[PDB]
């Protein structure tokens, strides 16, 4: 009689029973000796990590250039149309995002899994809520102040959009803490089908269920923002922000659907890298589909920079 | 001492019975239903082609592209006719000439809708000087040039995936009790995606070029059809994938078959059917 993997013929000792070779030790059939269940984690020389590294490097350089260029033109009405220092509150946070990808490479423990689970997905909610409330401005601020001026004009006068964004941040903190309690920070070990000799180690939300644990309110925010932006696709022309918002939302949606479809089937030891890829890509979406164009308008054409032109366009 | 995997002898059996061959034949109910769908597809497509060579000089058709449009329609007919290489007894030529010969025509035709979308975008968004230049350039051979470029890319990719992994026939003796399943096997989604890449790229490009264009005030817009046609292709592939991953082994050949039909039925109802219907009613419209 034989015994299937995980139970080795105890030829090291009494051979009557196919005792279980403890810990990583493991054998297929009879097979007196025991092997090692080597664990694998995202490595360096692996080409996919280098691809993601370039993707995360060029985009970060782009955001840094846009940061400096915007900062040095505090007077030009383009920089003043972004809402003011609020836009900077956006940009700075995005850097942290790209700065964290090197958390997804290296051996995984609680030290880095805490960041992976709690820090990175904090920003994304706020950074999409900013655009959501931005569309809220573009359309509502005059639509309801012109459709419901009876109270709206004074009701939204004092509770500026900042608090409405703050409540979304609050919900995000609540959900993050609830999930963290619901699960553990324990790193997770799994078995690689390519051969029993290999195994996997990852942070806890690696399961697509725990990954989707957060891609619900964020998707809700993205859809609402896209709706409002499309509402004013071309009828308004504040500084041509509805168009860019629409493009960024479309890219987000395509990335989400692509990842869902691919993970339906599974690809062995690829989920880590595919996940990092989608995260970096959805950051590039914003970093060079919302802020790049305004850098181009500021640094190539003064057709907007002139005070007269923008005092002309604000009214319309 | 059990009748060889060629024979699976059920319990309490002193005499073995050979496992019959198992392959999706040409008489199953499913294949008959899908071939009827094929008949409908071919009928509508050929009606379209006749119409498009009927009013060739008309202004409506002239705006659509004409000879590029006819090339597109004939290539769609070709792909629809290429839905009969999947069913039947596994054979080497049919195994090796099933996917590439069903994906080449789609790209060779979709090049054309990409041309239309690019021409719309040239005026809709770009500045005036580049708009004039591109209007004066793309209107000419440039269209046939891009068609040829797509065709060359698709053939190169086909050859690469071919040599890398030519699908082969396989026999499984332990999938169902009393039958040996002979079917053509592939390698995960590698070849699938490699053969899917180009037309997906073109479809996305058309969608992003023509999504935002303001609907023509009080007139039919050339953007609505392209957008609603591209979403059909995207949804079709994204929606069958789970099915093909989660279905009975034998009916697996029978899933790819279906997709190419429904997808085309979408396009011929989003870009060609509306123009054809107008043309039908052109004499009555004026």
Q: What is the 3-state secondary structure (H, E, C) of chain A?
A: CCCCCCCCCCCCCCCCCCCCCCCCCECCCCCCCCECCEEECCCCCCHHHHHHHHHHHHHHHHHHHHHHHHHCCCCCHHHHHCCCHHHHHHHHHHHHHHHHHHHCCCCCCHHHHHHHHHHHHHHHHHHHHHHHHHHHHHHHHHHHHHHCCCCHHHHHHHCCHHHHHHHHHHHHHHHHHHHHHHCCCCCEEEECCCCCCEEEEECHHHCHHHHHCCCCHHHHHHHHHHHHHHHCCCCCCCCCCHHHHHHHHHHHHHHHHHHHHHHHHCCCCCHHHHHHHHHHHHHHHHHCCCCHHHHHHHHHCCCCCCHHHHHHHHHC
- Which residue range is the domain that position A280 belongs to? 44-109+122-171+212-315
- Among B209, B212, B240, most A C-beta atoms within 10 A, so best to mutate, is B212
CA nearest to A264 within chain B: B242
Residue A237's CB is within 10 A of a number of other CB atoms, namely: 12
Do A64 and A15 fall into the same domain? no
With CB atoms and an 8 Å threshold, state whether A264 touches B211: no
C-beta atoms of A243 and B212 within 8 A: yes
In contact, B98 and B85? CB cutoff 8 Å: yes
Burial B55-92 (b: 16+ CB within 10 A, else e): beeeeebeebbeebbbbbbbbbbbbbebbebbbeebee
Give a yes or no: residue A226 inside a domain: yes
Question: Do the Cβ atoms of B19 and B173 come closer than 8 Å?
Answer: yes
* Distance in angstroms (rounded) separating the CA atoms of residues A221 and A230: 14
* Alpha-carbon span A7 to A15, nearest angstrom: 12
Q: Do A234 and A262 lie in a common domain?
A: yes
Within a domain: residue A187?
Answer: no
Resolution in A: 3.8
> How close is the nearest chain A Cα to the Cα of B34, in Å?
26
Chain A residues within an 8 Å CB radius of B214: 233-234
Distance from CA of B208 to the nearest CA of A (A): 8
Examine the domain organization and report whether A144 and A14 are in the same domain: no
Tokens of A175: 């959900």
Domain membership flag for residue A55? yes
Domain count, chain B: 1
SS (H, E, C) chain B: CCCCCCECCCCCCCCCCECEEECCCCCCHHHHHHHHHHHHHHHHHHHHHHHHHHCCCCHHHHHHCCHHHHHHHHHHHHHHHHHHCCCCCCCHHHHHCCCHHHHHHHHHHHHHHHHHHHHHHHHHCCCHHHHHHHHHHHCCCHHHHHHHHHHHHHHHHHHHHHHHCCCEEEEEEEEECCEEEEEEECCCCHHHHHHHHHHHHHHHHHHHHHCCCCCCCCCCCHHHHHHHHHHHHHHHHHHHHHHHHCCCCCCCHHHHHHHHHHHHHHHCCCCHHHHHHHHHHHHHHC
Q: For residues B262 and B41, what is the distance between their CA atoms, to the nearest angstrom?
A: 9
CB-neighbour burial class of residue B25 (10 A; exposed 0-12, middle 13-18, buried 19+)? exposed
Query: Same domain for A1 and A19?
Result: yes
Q: Are residues A141 and A273 in the same domain?
A: yes
Gyration radius from chain B CA atoms: 23
Decide if B61 is inside a domain. yes
Same domain, A105 and A231: yes
The answer as to whether A182 is a domain residue is: no
> Of A218, A228, A239, which is closest to residue A298 (Cα–Cα)?
A239
d(Cα A101, Cα A56) in Å, to the nearest integer?
8
| Maximum Cα interatomic distance, chain B, rounded to a whole number of Å | 87
Q: Do A267 and B208 touch (CB under 8 A)?
A: no
Check CB contact of A254 with chain B, cutoff 8 Å: yes
| Domain-located, residue B263 | yes
Q: Are residues A103 and A242 in the same domain?
A: yes
CA-based nearest residue to B198, from B241, B261, B153: B153
Q: Is residue A203 part of a domain?
A: no
Nearest CA in chain B to A268: B188
- Cβ(A222)–Cβ(A128) below 8 Å: yes
Contacts of B188 in chain A (CB under 8 A): 265, 267
Judge whether B126 is closer than 8 Å to chain A, CB to CB: no
Q: Hey, is the C-beta of B189 within 8 angstroms of any chain A C-beta?
A: yes
Is residue A288 included in any domain, yes or no?
A: yes
Q: Are residues A220 and A83 in the same domain?
A: yes
Q: Both A9 and A149 in a single domain?
A: no
Residue B3 lies in a domain: no
Test A265 with B189 for CB contact under 8 angstroms: yes
Total domains in chain A come to 2
| Structural domain containing residue B98 | 22-280
Q: Do residues A21 and A144 share a domain?
A: no
Q: What is the CATH number of the domain that holds B178?
A: 1.20.1070.10
Q: Are residues A95 and A231 in the same domain?
A: yes
Are A160 and A262 members of one domain? yes
Separation between Cα atoms, residue A45 and residue A23, nearest integer Å? 29
Cβ(B157)–Cβ(B199) below 8 Å: no
**Distance separating alpha carbons of residues A93 and A122, to the nearest angstrom:** 10
Instruction: Kindly state whether residue A178 falls inside one of the protein's structural domains.
Output: no
Query: Distance (Å, rounded) from C-alpha B246 to C-alpha B231?
Result: 24
Q: How many CB atoms lie within 10 A of CB A48?
A: 15
């Amino acid at each position: 009689i034989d015994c299937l993997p995980g139970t080795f013929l105890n030829h090291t000792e009494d051979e009557y029973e196919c005792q279980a070779c403890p810990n990583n030790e493991w054998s297929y059939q009879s097979e007196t000796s025991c092997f090692k269940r080597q664990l694998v984690f995202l490595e360096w020389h692996e080409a996919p990590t280098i691809a993601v590294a370039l993707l995360a490097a060029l985009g970060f350089l782009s955001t840094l250039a846009i940061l400096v260029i915007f900062w040095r033109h505090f007077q030009t009405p383009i920089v003043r149309s972004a809402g003011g220092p609020m836009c900077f509150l956006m940009l700075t946070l995005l850097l942290v995002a790209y700065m964290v990808v090197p958390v997804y490479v290296g051996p995984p423990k609680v030290s880095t899994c805490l960041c992976r689970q709690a820090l990175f997905p904090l920003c994304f909610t706020i950074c999409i809520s900013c655009i959501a409330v931005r569309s809220f401005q573009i359309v509502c601020a005059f639509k309801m102040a012109s459709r419901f001026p009876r109270a709206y004009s004074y009701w939204v006068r004092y509770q500026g959009p900042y608090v409405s964004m703050a409540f979304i941040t609050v919900l995000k903190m609540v959900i993050v803490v609830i999930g963290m309690l619901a699960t553990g920070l324990s790193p997770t070990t799994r078995t690689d089908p390519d051969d029993p000799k290999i195994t996997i180690v990852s942070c806890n939300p690696n399961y697509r269920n725990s990954l989707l644990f957060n891609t619900s309110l964020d998707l809700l925010l993205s859809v609402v923002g896209f709706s409002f932006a499309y509402m004013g696709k071309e009828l308004p022309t504040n500084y041509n922000e509805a168009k860019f918002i629409t493009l960024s939302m479309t890219f987000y949606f395509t990335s989400s659907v692509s990842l869902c479809t691919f993970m339906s089937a599974y690809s062995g030891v690829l989920v880590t890298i595919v996940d990092l890829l989608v995260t970096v890509l959805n950051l590039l979406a914003i970093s060079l589909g919302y802020f790049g164009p305004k850098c181009y308008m500021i640094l190539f054409y003064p057709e907007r920079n002139t005070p007269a032109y923008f005092n002309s366009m604000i009214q319309g | 001492t059990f009748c060889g995997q060629d024979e699976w002898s059920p319990e309490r059996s002193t005499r073995c019975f050979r496992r019959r061959s198992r392959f999706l034949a040409w008489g199953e109910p499913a294949v008959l239903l899908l071939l009827l769908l094929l008949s409908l597809a071919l009928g509508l497509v050929l009606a379209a082609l006749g119409l498009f060579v009927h009013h060739r000089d008309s202004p409506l058709v002239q705006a659509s592209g004409g000879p590029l449009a006819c090339f597109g329609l004939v290539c769609l007919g070709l792909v629809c006719l290429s839905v009969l290489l999947f069913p039947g007894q596994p054979s080497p030529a049919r195994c090796l000439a099933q996917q590439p010969l069903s994906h080449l025509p789609l790209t060779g035709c979709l090049s054309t809708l990409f041309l239309q979308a690019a021409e719309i975008f040239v005026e809709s968004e770009l500045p005036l000087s580049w708009a004039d230049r591109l209007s004066g350039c793309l209107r000419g051979p440039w269209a046939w040039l891009v068609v040829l470029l797509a065709m060359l890319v698709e053939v190169a990719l086909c050859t690469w995936y071919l040599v890398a992994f030519p699908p082969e026939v396989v026999t499984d003796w332990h999938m169902l009790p009393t039958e040996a399943l002979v079917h053509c096997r592939t390698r995960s989604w590698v070849s699938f995606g490699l053969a899917h890449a180009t037309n997906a790229t073109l479809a996305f490009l058309c969608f992003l070029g023509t999504f935002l264009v303001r609907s023509q005030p009080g007139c039919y817009n050339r953007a609505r059809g392209l957008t609603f046609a591209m979403l059909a292709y995207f949804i079709t592939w994204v929606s069958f994938v789970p099915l093909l991953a989660n279905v009975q082994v034998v009916l697996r050949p029978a899933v790819q078959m279906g997709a190419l039909l429904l997808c085309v039925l979408g396009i011929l109802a989003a870009f060609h059917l509306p123009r054809c219907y107008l043309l039908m009613r052109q004499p009555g419209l004026n």
